[PDB]
Design a protein around this nucleic acid. Structure first.
Ligand SMILES: Cc1cn([C@H]2C=C[C@@H](COP(=O)(O)OP(=O)(O)OP(=O)(O)O)O2)c(=O)[nH]c1=O
Ligand SMILES: [Mg+2]
Ligand SMILES: [Mg+2]
Lengths: 555, 412
DNA sequence: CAGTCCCTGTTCGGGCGCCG
DNA sequence: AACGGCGCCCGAACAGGGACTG
């Protein structure tokens, strides 16, 4: 006979054709034994745990661990076998609140519900599926077995049920206090208002008693009444916010798991510290699949790590969001496919910063990557503020106009202005739209053998110029690119080039300025040196002009 | 007092589990206001996390409308109940709708809110309203009545809709009425004054039983086709003939009688691209014969009702967009071109959004289906902006391609 | 006409950061 | 040695299309 809590239960079923968990216990140290017998006894008197008998043919092991800078212990059941047989839940936690999205509030209070999962009941017809024995002695007393009447910590349904139950309890209070903002993340509650400090504590006490009607306690241990508030890992001040102090490890020998933690902290730090790079550091995490393997820091990864530590020396901070002012996002190019940006409303008062250094595609250019950075910032800004910022981009209006009007795919950038801060983003060469009068016409072609990997590449021109080059360990695609490279090498500043390679033509028409292929990079270097290049395509094996002639040479 | 029509998913398929995407502030505020009224009216009910199903939701504004409209992306749920709205209670498509001089599209989705939904099926209509900056967890609902944007809604309401439209169809035997998704397609050969008058009479028939006041007008008899055309120059260069032979060779995949023998003979040698080549007597004859074949219709090209429609779009530049609708490759059921749409010369995504909406509308009128689109855009670019410009109550299937223009086939 | 190859793309799962 | 959420950078497995070979 256990009392039913005021919180409405959540009906939880299991996957059909499957039963409950039946896993043997895990032999643990005697320290854990004296840290859980006192818990199952206190929760039994408080109605959070009931005792069962032999009529419950289930069992589940459970260990424990300490807490964050505290003296209390955390009981974490290992429901990994129950989760495989429990129904799937749709998570209502859609993201992480960011302090740059918080608005200015005169009074702020941060709460923390004590015994979050232990104050929300479990489904009545589901408590039987949570059985676990507790031996008092490691090899003497068989131990009386208990069950769960609340949400166990470790079950895959506990977070979703708590977040949904907490919302239903706050819904009536929020309807009675519309001007009060309540950021609800797991058990921690951020409460803000523009009321006076005196009147603010009044509504806080009203909220603490409102939650008390459902068994939710807000103890004074984690009650925050004055800044700086520790919320979501940030330091919240009345007019600014900053990330809690980030410590980067400094080992004399670096392995693989150390860099994974190093790049991780730098990604977390890049949200407010401008100019953080992790290209050369993450470049060390390629190929090697041994987490305990020492990796020496390259000269590029060492200079990259040194410049990041100097950025973290000076303390930085972000501001809060003012809906009366516009959102501005300014991007800079950091080189080597690295981009950094800042989002602000007043100049030099950054709401947050960030980086975009993703390299997608074997061949690309700075205009494509700038477009991708703008999209990443737009989606991020809609998550945090629900609107798109005005952009300040280091690209001329004429440059962008030339790119998007001529590109064959649809592409677009929202309302933006040019900011003249080098290095500017430009197109390094422009293919002609019409053949060039007076320029030598190169008919290029390349063929390779699938078996021997041997091939030829060459050209034939209208002035009688000709070349064939034998190639070893190549492909048809490589010889087609090589043939174009030969035509660019052996031509003047203006050249018409005729190929039958859809592969090669498609790469060059997208005006790439960088490539994972050394051959394409060499082609790009030649295209920049030229003054006019006209690429034309013809179908192969159709007896078309010089394409038929150069086809005989390379095949 | 209405028995709920039992609805079952297709055998071997579970409900939709699609994540909600971020919404702007004005859209969240609109959806919160809309859902509060619908909940007060019992059309939707709040649910918990024990419902593992979810469908994205956002809001749109129709053309020349300042009123927000809730729009659910039921695309996943629709193709998991395909044996219902196509096999059990299907809606016949009239072949005369595309022949009418004027066709008005009326939003009738609000009528579906009067029919209850099968209790065993309401869990599949779950959607989640997001919050800005993740202030609060998602606010989940499920539908208690027939939802807008679900293909099962017009199928179940069809028995009710027939009785309402029965007096009007008897009063006007020449008017063709077609129902697709939340819309009603009313076509007539009457004059513009007579048509709009008869449309208002039909609105009054529905009133005696929030977007009924709108009426998007169409003219399928004015819909044009964009055939493959060949350039006509006074002088031809080597480069001109190379592009021509390249175009005709690709065109031979559609018209098998196209020849390029006499035109390829003009390019014998290794000539400069800009060298002018005079067309021979046989080349004039062969090019003239090819221009006539491009006017002749393609052999064995007809619509198969059991096959999906496919739409390809090409960005031609300068506000020009070409498209082809087909079921089998090189068997195009329709080819067209759009020019000077909204966003021309400034926004590719808005134009592409407009083009997709136009093509889909034509496919509903002509065949009663929505095509699967092959969009010439990067996935991340489309998924960032398309909802900002969407003005339709349905959403077609799409995929993303990247085809560099080797030959300008559909627009010289 | 199939069956490969070459090349490039997306999907996903795990590594890490961070929150509870 | 647990659960859920988001982000990044990584690689393996997979799909898809031109082009060559039997
Ligand atoms: C930190 C943490 C938390 N949780 C779940 C359990 C309760 C809520 C909040 O945890 P908590 O605030 O740190 O402890 P809590 O149970 O609320 O008890 P108190 O310390 O607040 O008194 O999230 C979890 O399952 N694993 C974890 O590692
Ligand atoms: Mg707590
Ligand atoms: Mg070739």
């Amino acid at each position: 006979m256990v009392p039913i809590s005021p919180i409405e239960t959540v009906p939880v079923k299991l996957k059909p054709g499957m039963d409950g968990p039946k896993v043997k216990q895990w032999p643990l140290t005697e320290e854990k034994i004296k840290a859980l017998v006192e818990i199952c006894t206190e929760m039994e008197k408080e109605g959070k745990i009931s005792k069962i008998g032999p009529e419950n043919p289930y069992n589940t092991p459970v260990f424990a661990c300490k807490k964050k800078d505290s003296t209390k212990w955390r009981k974490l059941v290992d429901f990994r076998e129950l989760n495989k047989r429990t129904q799937d839940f749709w998570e209502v936690q859609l993201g992480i609140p960011h302090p740059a999205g918080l608005k200015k509030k005169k009074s702020v209070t941060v709460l923390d519900v004590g015994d979050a999962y232990f104050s929300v009941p479990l489904d009545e017809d589901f408590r039987k599926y949570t059985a676990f024995t507790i031996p008092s002695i490691n090899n003497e007393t068989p131990g009386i077995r208990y069950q769960y009447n609340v949400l166990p910590q470790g079950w895959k349904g506990s977070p979703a049920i708590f977040q949904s139950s907490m919302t239903k309890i706050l819904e009536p209070f929020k309807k009675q206090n519309p001007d009060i903002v309540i950021y609800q993340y797991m058990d921690d509650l951020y409460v803000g208002s523009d009321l006076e400090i005196g009147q603010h504590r009044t509504k806080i006490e009203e909220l603490r008693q409102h939650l008390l009607r459902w068994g939710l306690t807000t103890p004074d241990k984690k009650h925050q009444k004055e800044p700086p508030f520790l919320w979501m890992g940030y330091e919240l001040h009345p007019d600014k916010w900053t990330v809690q102090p980030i410590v980067l490890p400094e080992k004399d020998s670096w392995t693989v798991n150390d860099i994974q933690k190093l790049v991780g902290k730098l990604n977390w730090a890049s949200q407010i510290y401008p100019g953080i790079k992790v290209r050369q550091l993450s470049k060390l995490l390629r190929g090697t699949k041994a987490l305990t393997e020492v990796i020496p820091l390259t000269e590029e990864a060492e200079l990259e790590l040194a410049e990041n530590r100097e950025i973290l020396k000076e303390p930085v901070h972000g501001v809060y969001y003012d809906p009366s002012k516009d959102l501005i996002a300014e991007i800079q190019k950091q080189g080597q496919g690295q981009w950094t940006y800042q989002i602000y409303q007043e100049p030099f008062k950054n709401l947050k910063t960030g980086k975009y250094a993703r390299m997608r595609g074997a061949h690309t250019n700075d205009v494509k990557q700038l477009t991708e950075a703008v999209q990443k910032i737009t989606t991020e800004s809609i998550v945090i503020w629900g609107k798109t910022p005005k952009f300040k981009l280091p690209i001329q209006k004429e440059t962008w106009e030339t790119w998007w009007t001529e590109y064959w795919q649809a592409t677009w950038i929202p309302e933006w202005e040019f900011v003249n801060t080098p290095p500017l983003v430009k197109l390094w060469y422009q293919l002609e739209k019409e053949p060039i009068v007076g320029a030598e016409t190169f008919y290029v072609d390349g063929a390779a053998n699938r078996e021997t990997k041997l091939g030829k590449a060459g050209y034939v021109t209208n002035k009688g110029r000709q070349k064939v080059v034998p190639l070893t360990n190549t492909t048809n695609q490589k010889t087609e690119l090589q043939a174009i490279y030969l035509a660019l090498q052996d031509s003047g500043l203006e050249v018409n080039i005729v190929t039958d390679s859809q592969y090669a033509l498609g790469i060059i028409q997208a005006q790439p300025d960088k490539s994972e292929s050394e051959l394409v990079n060499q082609i790009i270097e030649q295209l920049i040196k030229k003054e006019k290049v006209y690429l034309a395509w013809v179908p192969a094996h159709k007896g078309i002009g010089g394409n038929e002639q150069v086809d005989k040479l390379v095949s | 007092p209405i028995e709920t029509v039992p609805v079952k998913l297709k055998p071997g398929m579970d409900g939709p589990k699609v994540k909600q995407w971020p919404l702007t502030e004005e859209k969240i505020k609109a959806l919160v206001e809309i859902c509060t009224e619908m909940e007060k009216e019992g059309k939707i009910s709040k649910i918990g996390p024990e419902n593992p199903y979810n469908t994205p939701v956002f809001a749109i504004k129709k053309k020349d409308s300042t009123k927000w409209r809730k729009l659910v992306d039921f695309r996943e749920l629709n193709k998991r109940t395909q044996d219902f709205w196509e096999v059990q209670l299907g809606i016949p498509h009239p072949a005369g709708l595309k022949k009418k001089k004027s066709v008005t599209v009326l939003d009738v989705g609000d009528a579906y809110f009067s029919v209850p939904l099968d209790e065993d099926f309401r869990k599949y209509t779950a959607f989640t309203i997001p919050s800005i900056n993740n202030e609060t967890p998602g606010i989940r609902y499920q539908y208690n009545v027939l939802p807008q944007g679900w293909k099962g809604s017009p199928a179940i309401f069809q028995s009710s809709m027939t009785k309402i439209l029965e007096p009007f169809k008897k009063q006007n035997p020449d008017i063709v009425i077609y129902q697709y998704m939340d819309d009603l397609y009313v076509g007539s050969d009457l004059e513009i004054g007579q048509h709009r008058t008869k449309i208002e009479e039909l609105r009054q028939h529905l009133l005696r039983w929030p977007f009924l006041w709108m009426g998007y007008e169409l003219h399928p008899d004015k819909w044009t086709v964009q055939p493959i055309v060949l350039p006509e120059k006074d002088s031809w260069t080597v480069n001109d003939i190379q592009k021509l032979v390249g175009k005709l060779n690709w065109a031979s995949q559609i018209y098998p009688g196209i020849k390029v023998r006499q035109l390829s003979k003009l390019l014998r040698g290794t000539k400069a691209l800009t060298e002018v080549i005079p067309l021979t007597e046989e080349a004039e004859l062969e090019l003239a014969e090819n221009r006539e074949i491009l006017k002749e219709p393609v052999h064995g090209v007809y619509y198969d009702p059991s096959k999906d429609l496919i739409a390809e779009i090409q960005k031609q530049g300068q506000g020009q967009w070409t498209y082809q609708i087909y079921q089998e490759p090189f068997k195009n059921l329709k080819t067209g071109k759009y020019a000077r749409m909204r966003g021309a010369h400034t926004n590719d995504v808005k134009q592409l959004t407009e083009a997709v909406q136009k093509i889909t509308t034509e496919s509903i009128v002509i065949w009663g289906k929505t095509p699967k689109f092959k969009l010439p855009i990067q996935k991340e670019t489309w998924e960032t902006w398309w909802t900002e410009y969407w003005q339709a109550t349905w959403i077609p299937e799409w995929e993303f391609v990247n085809t560099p223009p080797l030959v300008k086939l559909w627009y010289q």
